[PDB]
């Protein structure tokens, strides 16, 4: 009777950077996933655990949606059980992940605003974010907090220009995370 919000989350004007990713959730409605596997814009549309083709039958309790901006080369890295620059220090999925991940090819619609995190002394726990800006003191010497030798900024900026950029085309990926059955569920298929 009231279709769950999907249109604006998969199609709006502003997408946050990878280092700080918004986490939208859905409380109470019916969500026909018909538009998902239909439109050709969704390039990857790769799904794990529960079946991709028949998601209507399930009756989950809380569906969580988060949005990234990835350089495009690292899209294959988003999958669980993968290692690299961004899956270790920016966003880590649990091994038994439930849900789907979707990747676009949006370069024409969308610079210097996008920026990611590069430096840390440890990996991130699953489903954890870190809005922290403090120079990590690379050298053994104490670091005051002013840019200098052995003191590097933890955040670095992408450069997005309309080259060929087959690996460097700025991509936007949204991964749907599905929770278990805590309370009487309020989202299903029909």
């Amino acid at each position, epitope marked *: 009777t009231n279709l769950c919000p999907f249109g604006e989350v998969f199609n709006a004007t502003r997408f946050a950077s990878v280092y700080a990713w918004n986490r939208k959730r859905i409380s109470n409605c019916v969500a026909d996933y018909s538009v998902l596997y239909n439109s050709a814009s969704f390039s990857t549309f790769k799904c794990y655990g529960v079946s991709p083709t028949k998601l209507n039958d399930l009756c989950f309790t809380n569906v969580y949606a988060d949005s990234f901006v990835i350089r495009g080369d690292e899209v294959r890295q988003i999958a669980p059980g993968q290692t690299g620059k961004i899956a270790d220090y920016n966003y880590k999925l649990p091994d038994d992940f439930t849900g789907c991940v979707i990747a676009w090819n949006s370069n024409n619609l969308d610079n210097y605003n996008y920026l990611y995190r590069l430096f840390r*002394k440890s*990996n991130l726990k699953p489903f954890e974010r870190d809005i922290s800006t403090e120079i990590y003191q690379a050298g053994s010497t104490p670091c005051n907090g002013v840019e200098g030798f052995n003191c*590097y900024f933890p955040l670095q900026s992408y*450069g997005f220009q309309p080259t060929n950029g*087959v690996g460097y085309q700025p991509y936007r990926v949204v991964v749907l995370s599905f929770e278990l059955l805590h309370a009487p569920a309020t989202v299903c298929g029909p």
Partner: single-chain antibody
Amino acid sequence: VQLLQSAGGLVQPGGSLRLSCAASGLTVSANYMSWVRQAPGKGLEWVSVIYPGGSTFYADSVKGRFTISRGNSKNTLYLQMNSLSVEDTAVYYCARDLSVAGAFDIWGQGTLVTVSIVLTQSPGTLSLSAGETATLSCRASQSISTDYLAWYQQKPGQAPRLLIYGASNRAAGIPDRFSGSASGTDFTLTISRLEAEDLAVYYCQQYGSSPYTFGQGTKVEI
């Protein structure tokens, strides 16, 4: 700050060996490390990277025969070798890795082991007299961003160092005689007021794109 190495010898094929890269004034547990191979005359190559978190990668060409390890109890980096082949003989370097703010700020001293995307540098030899500008151009096989590429110089019998990092950005301690440009897929390096001290070989290197690749190598001549 100084990096030092301790290994070497003569080993028959299939034998074992290990190499130690010990640091001073630079913590190894929190900073990137990388091992590179210099074949006897071919050029340079990339062998491994250890991220600070603990993750490790390897060169796609050879991964099983090597195994890199991190040691935090001695601020050092051990590299272990399963077995050796005749094709594997080369001199080895260990160098700190910075992704964008510089590429390889510091380099080791070099140890010897024996056995019992594409880049191209156009000019080639470019033998010119003193005081004459020498122009070197490195072209990429595929389209690349203006950043993500560096420029290295190898004095004879010396460890490699960098001159210009990230297109035209100049690192500390380098005279202002070097300033490279960036236009499309063609990159150039210019040396002004040529001096007899700078007889060496220059390499163009890319980072971040893929398993790191180095150019064939060109030698300036006086």
